[PDB]
Every structure is written in C-alpha cells, then in structure tokens.
Structure 1
Amino acid sequence: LDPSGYNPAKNNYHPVEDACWKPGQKVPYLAVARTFEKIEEVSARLRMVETLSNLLRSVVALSPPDLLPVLYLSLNHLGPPQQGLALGVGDGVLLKAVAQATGRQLESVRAEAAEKGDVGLVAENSRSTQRLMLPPPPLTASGVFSKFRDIARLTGSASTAKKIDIIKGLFVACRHSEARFIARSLSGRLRLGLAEQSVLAALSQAVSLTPPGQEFPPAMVDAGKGKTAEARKTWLEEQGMILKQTFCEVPDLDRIIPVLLEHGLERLPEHCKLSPGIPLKPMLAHPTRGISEVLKRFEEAAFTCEYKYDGQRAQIHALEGGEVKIFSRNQADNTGKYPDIISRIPKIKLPSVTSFILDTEAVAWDREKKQIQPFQVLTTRKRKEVDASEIQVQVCLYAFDLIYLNGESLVREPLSRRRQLLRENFVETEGEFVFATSLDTKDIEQIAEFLEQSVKDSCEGLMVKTLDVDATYEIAKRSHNWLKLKKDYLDGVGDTLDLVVIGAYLGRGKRAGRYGGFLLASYDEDSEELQAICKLGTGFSDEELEEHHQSLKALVLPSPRPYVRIDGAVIPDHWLDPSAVWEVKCADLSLSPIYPAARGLVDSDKGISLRFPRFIRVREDKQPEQATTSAQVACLYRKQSQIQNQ
C-alpha cells in the first residue's frame, strides 16, 4: 500500500489489513509521521493513545524488531537516560542544515522559523532542491533512529559539519510530512501533545489487544472482542499498571521491550524488578499553596514534615558486590561526579548492610563554618572525571527515603517502615551524612514554626508525606504523592518585585504568533538607567498573554532607548518603550554573571537576577520611575537567610 494514505486513527483499525507495509519489512518513517499527524490533530489524550496503540499494534504484528525505535521516536528519546546520549545540535545548526537542504539563505529560514515558531513548518514547505535529483530511497523508522544516534555520537573538532551533513541527508530523503517531524525532533520540540505517560498507555494497550510472540498471520489481533465496555476498561488499566509500575522500577526500554516481546506483559515483573545499579524513577512532589491545603488532600491521615534542602537529588545504589553508583533525578549517571561520596559510603551504614538504594539530597557544605551553602555554590563542582583530591566544594548528604535494603525491595512498604529501616541501619555523621530534619505532628502552629525554622536553617520550605495511608514508593499509582510547601507559594511572603518591561521575545509552539517571553529591568537611580534583571515567561494566562501582545506591540522600538542596559542578556526580538510595570514574584535572588541589575552594590563584577520569576499582575498605577530600584534589589538579596548565614 501507500504510506502516504496511512490512517492509524480510523474506526475499526486492523493491525494487518490497515497497515502500509508488508510483514518482515522495516516500518516506513512516513507511517510514523502519519501517526504523528493524527496525534497532533486531536486534543483528547484517549484519542491520542488509541492512534499510537494502533501503530504499535501493526508493528508488534508485522515488524517486531522495529518496536524499540518507533517507541523512542514517539518519545523523542535517543535511548536510556543513564547512557547520556545527547544530540549536540543547536537551533542555529539545525537552521543552517535546513537552509542548505532547501537551497535558501540562512536569514530567510531564520526569519520564517521565528515568525512561525516552528522549524518543522519551514523545513517541510521548502523543496526547491527536491526537483533537482531523483527521489532517494524512502526513510525507515529504524534508519531514521540510527541516524539520530549517529548525530549524537559525533564528537570533537569539525563534528558540527558532520552533524549537518547527516541532517541534510535526512531532509533530502524526506517526503510529505517527514521533514516537519524530523526537524521538530532535532530541535527537541516534537509538539505532539503525547509523551511518556501516554506512550506507556499506548504500549500496554497495543500488546494487550495484539499480543506479541505470535505466528503470522496473527491468531489474535484484538483480545478485547468478546468483552463489555466496563470489562475491557478495567482489563486495560490492570495491564497498563503492570507496565507502568515496572517502568518506574526500570525506566529502560532497552531492557523492557526485549523481555516484553518474549514473555509478554504478564511475566514482565518477574524479569524486570528493582535492583541496585539500575536507576529508578524518583518520587515527585505536588506544590501546595498553604498549610490548610495540606490538611485537605491528606484528610485524616497522619503525615510527617521534613526540611526541603536546596541541593541536587542523589539516588545512591550500593550493590551486593560493594560497587557504588549514584544517579540524578533524570536517571543520569552521577557516579564520577561525587568521588568524595564514594569514599564515605563505609561511614554511613552498619556492618550488617549488604545492599541498599538511598534517596538523598546532595547539599554543598562549608566545613570551616559548619553551615549549608546555597545551590549556586553546589553547581560550581565538576561534572565528570573528578578526582577526590581536587574536590573544592564539599557535599553533605541528607537522606530522606530508603528503597532497597539487603536484597529486598521496600517499594510497596509504607513510609513509616522505610523511615524506620533507614534509621536503624544508618549512622549520623554530621556535615557528611545526616537525616532530614523531621517533625511528625498535626498542629498548625507547630507546622508554621517548622516552616519558618527551615528557611532560617538555609532551606526552601517543607516536604509533607503521609506515613501509613497511601505512603508507598509506587510512582505508577501517583507520581506526585508528596507535597511541597514553600514560602513563595503563600500570597503574603512579600518577595514581589515591580519591574519594567523593556523587551519581548517571539514565542514558539504553544506561543507561536505572540510573545513567549519578556525582558524585565530595574531602575538604577544613581546611573539613571534601567538595568535588565531577568526574563519572564510564566505566570500569564492565555488571555493575558494576548492582551500583553496587543498592548505592547504599539511600544515596539527599532532600537533600544539610550538609558537601557542589558549587558550580556539575550538581545530581545522586539525592543519596547519602557512604560509597562508588572508585579513579579520569585523564590530567591541570585548573583548573576550576565544581568547588570544592581551590579556593584553587592558584588564588584556581578549583578543580581531572580530565581524562578513568575508574573502576578500588571501595575497600572505605576510608571517606570516608581518601579523597584536596584538599591531595593541589593537589599532584598542581602536579607536572604542563606546570604545572612554567611
């Protein structure tokens, strides 16, 4: 058949008959791109999962070995996260490859990509070089995926030119809508509306409806034929939960897909279980906007409150053989980053401990002062090839959960149990390995003082977790089972700044057409200058963003006003007449190496920016001169508890 007319969203989809490729033959990338079209067209997640499941069903029945690349293409992933593969292709490089492939000038394609907010639309609607040669052989799914890995593997000098040539070869072989999705994949903005959770749902539904390991033609193609609506409903969720719980234990398609294709979904938890050395998905936290919101949602269930430390999450694995591994919250290998940690594993556990998986937070520590250092100090550590002698920023560990212990998994255990084992079999070495400052209560005043004390002790806020009711480490049940209580979540903390809009940025994707971001500035009275302080991109409603785009479009200037100073900040696409004042909330103030706001008032060669800036409201009663001054910004930074604890 023709991959051009592939419709994986048709009613009564047959995996074998409605396919556009013969069995044993490699899956054409156009079939993947056609499935991406139908997925992008709809907004309901259930319709998106069904369309993908249909494509996965034809793959599992006609070309099983192509299931792994098709899943990775739908996720826009290069492979397992612990392998650390990265494309290494910037937007400027992708645009240079698009311009060279289409025969157009770089300025033409760059203006169009910014105006459209999508590189895929530019790379597709340009084929002035396709009428130059005979059509290259059609693209395959596994072939496109391997070429993506080829790009990611090129390193060293002159590697950029080699990446461009591979991207160029893909575009000249693209037909119909393939160029739009290949360019979207390289830029890291697939924009499908479907991601990890929906792919997992589509995979479990596809292998349940069309089981793998069958002979061809497949005896079973729709195992939900003789079932009722509520029966097929509850059967698919039970199957989807088996896949989701094991993927949370082993988020590695390279390990799950082969076992899946050989033993089926039923026997998967027997082969892929939680084990040290293999990173697992961490437990996340849902943001709570107040103490009262914690009493609800948890209702009549006992919980605990722990200090929210400002560092980097460290998932530490101790294998039975003695080898030690550390993983980030994205399952990235961080073992070579903490040699100081590895030397101290003996000092944290009892002689009876043989294997464990620890959930801790690596926080920068000052041994000469016995205090916690801010996150900016922690980020100055080296990332790889670190030798313990040259470690200049010490790290203190704050363990708050225990997942594995002596060969048994505690995932299905309540937090009250996991916390107990973590206390009995681990030792306190202050400034090295300490337990999270905990406090079990239900008193609002006690919780309020604990929230205050945490920030006095160089912490962001509190973490609230139940102890016995829904207090397991099963992410597939609820990925955000913990609660997050910070000061800036409450609407009275007062860290609101009134800043002037001095620039706008063209939006991409969901923000194509209007402004996606804005440049904010503070007024320096002594220099009579507006100093850029940060960029702003979140906090607007969709209706507010169109009001800003309309109101600020009249103030667009061809050149910046002479009294505006942005230093090394990103030059805005549209310079704006300094007139709009917006209220902006942030979590912290940081010493910036780029922004010139309040430079000299705290550090001689560094300014101040805002950590996690968000838009609150427009200050219509205010004018640029009445905005927050750089002197106020310098004082706000000084009054910070971590800055005061210095």
Structure 2
Amino acid sequence: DPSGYNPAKNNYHPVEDACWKPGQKVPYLAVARTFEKIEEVSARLRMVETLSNLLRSVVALSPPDLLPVLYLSLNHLGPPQQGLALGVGDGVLLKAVAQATGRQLESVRAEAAEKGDVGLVAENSRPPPPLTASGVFSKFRDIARLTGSASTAKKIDIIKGLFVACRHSEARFIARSLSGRLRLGLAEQSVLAALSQAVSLTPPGQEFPPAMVDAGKGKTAEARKTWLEEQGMILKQTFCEVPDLDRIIPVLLEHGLERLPEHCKLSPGIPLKPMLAHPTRGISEFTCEYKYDGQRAQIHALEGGEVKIFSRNQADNTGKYPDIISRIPKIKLPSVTSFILDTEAVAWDREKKQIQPFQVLTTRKRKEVDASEIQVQVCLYAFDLIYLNGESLVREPLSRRRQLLRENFVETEGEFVFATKDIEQIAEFLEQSVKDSCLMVKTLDVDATYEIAKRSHNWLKLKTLDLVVIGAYLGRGKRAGRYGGFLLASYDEDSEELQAICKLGTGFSDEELEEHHQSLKALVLPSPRPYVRIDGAVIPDHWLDPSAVWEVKCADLSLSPIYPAARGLVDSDKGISLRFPRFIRVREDKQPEQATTSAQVACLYRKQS
C-alpha cells in the first residue's frame, strides 16, 4: 500500500519494499512519501539514499517512469533549452485551492501568508482515481503550454483536478511544486548523486526477475564508497557537458553509466553548464581579466552555419540577438567550422564608443524582429573557448584555449573584442576596471580545465550606508514565524520625510534576526507614520516605529522606478535603490536623525558612472 511506503528503510528491497506492482505506473504518493522522508531529515547523505531507494524501484519495476520522477524531484518541466515555464503563481494557486474546497479566498490567503507554505492550506482543507507520477508530470507540462486568453481559468481547472484527486500528503507537494518552492533540501547536485547510486546498486537493463539489487554487497565500506563516488563523477561530468535529462536517461538505460561518456558527449547546439567563480577576499586571498558587468552568452555554431546563443542557465537566447547571428563570420577565420565560445555581452553605444551599464542591456527585447528595430547594441568580450572544429577542448589547459581563441578569433571594432603577479600592476588594472566600467582571476595551466564537476567555482572574483527601518515583512520557508525582510528608508532633509530605498532580507544571522525580532517587537504600529513615504514599494506586514538604524552594504546605486529615495535629485521621476543590499551591523549609537540622507544618496549615485 502506497499509504505506508517507506524509502528510508534499512536494507531497502527495491522489489519487495516497493508499493506498486511491476509493470504498473508509479503512484505519486510513492513520490510524495519519498519527499516526506527527505524533508524529515537534514543530512544530505540520508536524503540521497532515501531518494535513491525510490529510483531503484523505478529502475527495476517501472523503467519508463524514471524521467518524470527525476523531473518531479528537480521540480522542473524539462531541458532548460525547451523553456517550458509553468506560468502559475500565488494568486492562481490559492484560487485553485479555494475552488477545490472551502472557497473563502481571503481565509485561504491569510492562512498561507502566516504559514509561509501554501501546501499546508491545501492539505488541511476539509472517489477520484489515484494519482500517477507520469500523469501528474503530464499535467504540469499541460499547464505550462496553456497560453492566451482564458488560460488562467484553464490552468485552475487542471490544478483543481489535481487537488481533488490528491490523497494523504499529495496536496502538499503538488502545491509546493506549482508554487516553485518545493523546499525539499534536495536539488540538482544531490539528485545526480541519488541517480548514480541507484543505477549502480540496481543496474538497468535487467530481466523481469531482478537479477541484481544491491551490487555493493560483495564490497567493503571503503570499496562501496569509493566505487559509488567514482561512478558519480562519470554522471556529473557528463551532465555538466550535456545538462539534458531527456538525452542522458535514454542512454543511461541502454549503455549503462560506465559507457555514458561515450554516447552523451559535448556537441554544438547543446548548451553546457558554464564555469562559475568564487568570491576572493582580495589580492591576499595566474591571469587577470575584466569582469564586464553584462550578461553571459554561450555562442554555439554547428556544422552548416547554424548559430545558437545560450545563456548561463542553458536558456535559448538565439532570438534575442539576431545581430550576432548576422555577424558571426566577421570574427571566425576560414578554418572555423564548429566552435563554442564563452563571451559576456555588454551594451555598447557605437557612436560614443563607450560601454553602457547593465540596466541598459536589460532593456532589450527577448524576441527581436531584426536589427532595424534594435536600439541597444551589444558588444562581445570573449574570454574562453570550449569547442573548435569537431574537437572538445574541456580537458585542455586555459593557456592552450587562449592561444586558439587569440589565433582563430578575429577581433572586430565595436563587437568582437577579446578581453602577472605584480601587486601594484594588478591594483592598477583593478582600479582601471572601475575606470573602464568593469577583475577576473583564473589559472593558466595548473587546475585550469573547463571541468565543472571537479570544482563548480574554481575561478576567483576580484571585487556603506546607514538607513532606518520603517517596516517589516513576514518570512517564508526557513523564515516562517520570524521576520523575513525589512523595509529601509533614508531621510530627506529638504522635506523632512523618510523615503524608502530598498528591502533587506539577507546578511543577518539567525541569532541576529531574533535580536532584531525582539528589539523591534514593541515598535509595531497599526498605521504608518505621516512622515514616512514608500511610493510604490510593498506595504510592510508590520509598520515599525522609525527608531532602528542599520548599516547596509550594496554593490551599486540604481535608478529605481518604485522607490522614492532621492526622487528629483538625479531623475525627475525615478528614485534611487540599492543593488545587492545586505545587512552588516546595527548602529545602536545612532538615531533616525543621524542617518544617510537622500541628498547623500544622490551624491553617491553621481560618483559612480
């Protein structure tokens, strides 16, 4: 009976300890029961095993259901290049739960807001055939394909049909999946670890009578551990080169995991997971390049001239840059017939020959008609090469890939322009980075391969205000019960009014948050003060008496179309907000009068470009 399925049992038998007959479809409660045990523990090694147990039974009883439960565990709808967006938010979900039972949208809303989880409302609310993992996944994609008018009403009917067919704790995880907050403590890295362990303990491609169930029986603890970790590296590396489960799982079920690297290989047109960077504390904590504050572009080109542009998250951005598809042969030499460059596109004013900030680049359309309607032109600063003429260059060192790019890449004016241990020299380039409106520290030969599975962020990144609190927001998930965010403001000396500037939801410890919770508890106001102005920011759940001064760090100052801070001092209709805000400390010495004035905020914004 799936009502008592336990994938966290000692000596889990993939065939006996299951809850569905072989050949039959996997019930969603088996998935819901597995999620309930994953969220019940905290150690990832226990989460990976519990999830792996279900994957064993799936890989032995219902093989074709493996891709759905994997995508259902990832809370994804398919490959990232497909772009299947669910298009369901809080309002659609709560309205679907209201029509599912009880009605009273306000009661459904206010309960979930304090709980921080809509799954508890849909579950605790007081005939249909049982739910299937494939069927639930098929309806998730059916919801994502619904577009046009009356699409929301069509989505609600599917969600209503799912909730009425839910049993036990199925309404919890369907509501969390549709809300995009599965909150399971398990994600992409651990899913792969559970998949690699499952196909190794219970190998795929066996007869109806399961021949092998626990292939680690004839090994010792050090052997099984080493054997499982070596096999996980084969899967994780291949996924870093082909992050597409619709392509790995079919191969993984026929050729096995040991032969997976031979079939699923790096190929143009298939986006790969890119190289990330870690935060370097400074020169105290090797090539150095500019960190162009723009958007990453993975330019692919297959055999035949077909060009495809992908983002950092393997999203298809080919249609967003028609100006690049019609300008690729201007940089590749005659020997180039297949290549994958790693470049960071940045907005460029061809007239003034200057780089434009990140805000100007975000004003481009996602589906551009042609270059005749494109106003914001982009410039490409290439920095790495992964593919070249049918040859994968992942295992090659960084110094070798830079030579091939600097040879075959032909720099063109305005578009294609490819981007020592002397401390004073490095400080000049770091200071000239801000000067040229941009540092990146990367290795050359030692540990300088494009292998994301060895280290996800093997690169290094070379890169204050005092505001008052005026409001607070109720937290969600791990912040339920306490305060999740805070509304901050500056003081306008000319008009004597607090002007909201940004929200604050990071930088404080759990102990520091409870200190903020207790210190600002008695300052709860029923109505906002008359000398407080927020413009169009989110109305705080608890209006607080202006008395607490916090020091906040941020990356940049940006013209805010919603915050009233310093409106009229830099733009006639836009205020100023903080980019990447974060709590630093509490200024118990200061009062709201000794705070960063809006006149000072405008001076900070003029200092930066």
TM-score (norm 1): 0.93
Alignment partner of 1:34: what SS?
helix
Contact 1:61 1:212 in 2 (8 A): yes
1:261, distance to aligned residue in structure 2 (A): 0.8
User: What per-residue deviation string (whole Å, max 9, x for no partner) do you get for residues 349-371 of structure 1?
Assistant: 11111110000000000111111
Alignment partner of 2:121: what SS?
helix
1:111, distance to aligned residue in structure 2 (A): 1.1
Q: Distance in 2 between matches of 1:634 and 1:182?
A: 47
Alignment partner of 1:615: what SS?
strand
1:384, distance to aligned residue in structure 2 (A): 1.1
Q: Distance in 1 between matches of 2:51 and 2:209?
A: 21
Q: 229-238 or 11-20, which moves further after superposition?
A: 229-238
Q: Distance in 1 between matches of 2:315 and 2:486?
A: 32
Alignment partner of 1:402: what SS?
strand
Contact 2:289 2:440 in 1 (8 A): yes
Alignment partner of 1:151: what SS?
helix
Aligned sequence identity (%): 100
Contact 1:578 1:624 in 2 (8 A): yes
User: What per-residue deviation string (whole Å, max 9, x for no partner) do you get for residues 309-342 of structure 1?
Assistant: 0100000001111110000101000000001111
Contact 2:27 2:130 in 1 (8 A): yes
Contact 2:294 2:346 in 1 (8 A): yes
Alignment partner of 2:367: what SS?
coil
1:229, distance to aligned residue in structure 2 (A): 0.9
Q: Distance in 1 between matches of 2:518 and 2:137?
A: 42
Of 301, 307, 315 in structure 2, the residue corresponding to residue 318 of structure 1 is 301
Q: Distance in 2 between matches of 1:427 and 1:406?
A: 16
Aligned to 1:76: 75
Alignment partner of 2:521: what SS?
helix
User: What per-residue deviation string (whole Å, max 9, x for no partner) do you get for residues 56-91 of structure 1?
Assistant: 000000000000000000000011110101111111
1:408, distance to aligned residue in structure 2 (A): 0.1
Of 405, 409, 425 in structure 2, the residue corresponding to residue 446 of structure 1 is 425
Contact 1:314 1:361 in 2 (8 A): yes
Q: Distance in 1 between matches of 2:434 and 2:330?
A: 29
Aligned to 2:437: 458
Q: Distance in 1 between matches of 2:367 and 2:56?
A: 41
Alignment partner of 1:571: what SS?
coil
Aligned to 1:568: 536
- Superposed, 1:380-529 pairs within 5 Å as 380-436=363-419, 441-459=420-438, 462-485=439-462, 496-529=464-497
Aligned to 1:108: 107
Alignment partner of 2:47: what SS?
helix
Q: Distance in 1 between matches of 2:97 and 2:279?
A: 41
Q: Distance in 2 between matches of 1:122 and 1:609?
A: 35
Contact 1:501 1:519 in 2 (8 A): yes
1:204, distance to aligned residue in structure 2 (A): 0.3
Aligned to 1:341: 324
Alignment partner of 1:42: what SS?
coil
Alignment partner of 1:598: what SS?
coil
1:395, distance to aligned residue in structure 2 (A): 0.3
1:54, distance to aligned residue in structure 2 (A): 0.4
Of 229, 233, 243 in structure 2, the residue corresponding to residue 241 of structure 1 is 233
1:281, distance to aligned residue in structure 2 (A): 0.2
User: What per-residue deviation string (whole Å, max 9, x for no partner) do you get for residues 410-468 of structure 1?
Assistant: 001110111111101101113211111xxxx1122222222111011101xx1111111
1:290, distance to aligned residue in structure 2 (A): 1.4
Contact 1:211 1:220 in 2 (8 A): yes
Q: Distance in 1 between matches of 2:542 and 2:410?
A: 57
1:96, distance to aligned residue in structure 2 (A): 1.1
1:385, distance to aligned residue in structure 2 (A): 4.0
Q: Distance in 1 between matches of 2:573 and 2:211?
A: 72
Alignment partner of 2:131: what SS?
coil
Q: Distance in 1 between matches of 2:16 and 2:380?
A: 57
Q: Distance in 1 between matches of 2:10 and 2:301?
A: 51
Q: 543-552 or 27-36, which moves further after superposition?
A: 543-552
1:574, distance to aligned residue in structure 2 (A): 1.0
User: What per-residue deviation string (whole Å, max 9, x for no partner) do you get for residues 492-538 of structure 1?
Assistant: xxxx0101111111110010101111111111111111111011111
Q: Distance in 1 between matches of 2:511 and 2:308?
A: 48
Contact 1:281 1:329 in 2 (8 A): yes
Q: 374-383 or 95-104, which moves further after superposition?
A: 95-104
Q: Distance in 2 between matches of 1:463 and 1:222?
A: 46
Contact 2:299 2:307 in 1 (8 A): yes
Contact 1:6 1:31 in 2 (8 A): yes
Aligned to 1:281: 273
Contact 2:471 2:544 in 1 (8 A): yes
Aligned to 2:575: 607
Contact 1:338 1:386 in 2 (8 A): no
1:589 partnered with 2:581: no
Contact 2:122 2:172 in 1 (8 A): yes
Aligned to 2:546: 578
Q: Distance in 1 between matches of 2:326 and 2:391?
A: 25
Q: Distance in 2 between matches of 1:102 and 1:619?
A: 49
Alignment partner of 1:337: what SS?
coil
Contact 2:48 2:191 in 1 (8 A): yes
Would you say how many aligned residue pairs link Structure 1 and Structure 2? 607
Contact 1:516 1:537 in 2 (8 A): yes
Q: Distance in 1 between matches of 2:520 and 2:149?
A: 44
Aligned alpha-carbon RMSD (Å):
0.8
Alignment partner of 1:505: what SS?
strand
Q: Distance in 2 between matches of 1:387 and 1:432?
A: 17
Q: Distance in 2 between matches of 1:94 and 1:319?
A: 42
1:104, distance to aligned residue in structure 2 (A): 3.5
Q: Distance in 2 between matches of 1:504 and 1:90?
A: 23
Contact 1:327 1:333 in 2 (8 A): yes
Q: Distance in 2 between matches of 1:385 and 1:3?
A: 50
User: What per-residue deviation string (whole Å, max 9, x for no partner) do you get for residues 558-608 of structure 1?
Assistant: 111111111111111111111111000000000111111100001111111
1:611, distance to aligned residue in structure 2 (A): 0.5
**Unpaired segments ≥5 residues, structure 1:** 128-134, 293-302, 486-495, 642-646
Q: Distance in 2 between matches of 1:110 and 1:553?
A: 24
Aligned to 2:93: 94
1:343, distance to aligned residue in structure 2 (A): 1.3
Alignment partner of 1:548: what SS?
helix
1:246, distance to aligned residue in structure 2 (A): 0.6
User: What per-residue deviation string (whole Å, max 9, x for no partner) do you get for residues 543-571 of structure 1?
Assistant: 11111112222111111111111111111
Alignment partner of 1:145: what SS?
helix
Q: Distance in 2 between matches of 1:385 and 1:281?
A: 25
Contact 1:523 1:628 in 2 (8 A): yes
1:13 partnered with 2:17: no
Q: Distance in 2 between matches of 1:260 and 1:352?
A: 35
Contact 1:316 1:327 in 2 (8 A): yes
Aligned to 1:492: none
Q: Distance in 1 between matches of 2:542 and 2:137?
A: 38
Contact 2:368 2:374 in 1 (8 A): no
Q: Distance in 2 between matches of 1:64 and 1:551?
A: 56
Contact 2:322 2:368 in 1 (8 A): no
Q: Distance in 1 between matches of 2:593 and 2:256?
A: 68
1:31, distance to aligned residue in structure 2 (A): 0.4
1:265, distance to aligned residue in structure 2 (A): 0.7
More helix by share: 1
**Unpaired segments ≥5 residues, structure 2:** none
Contact 2:321 2:368 in 1 (8 A): no
Alignment partner of 2:584: what SS?
strand
Contact 1:118 1:508 in 2 (8 A): yes
1:41, distance to aligned residue in structure 2 (A): 0.7
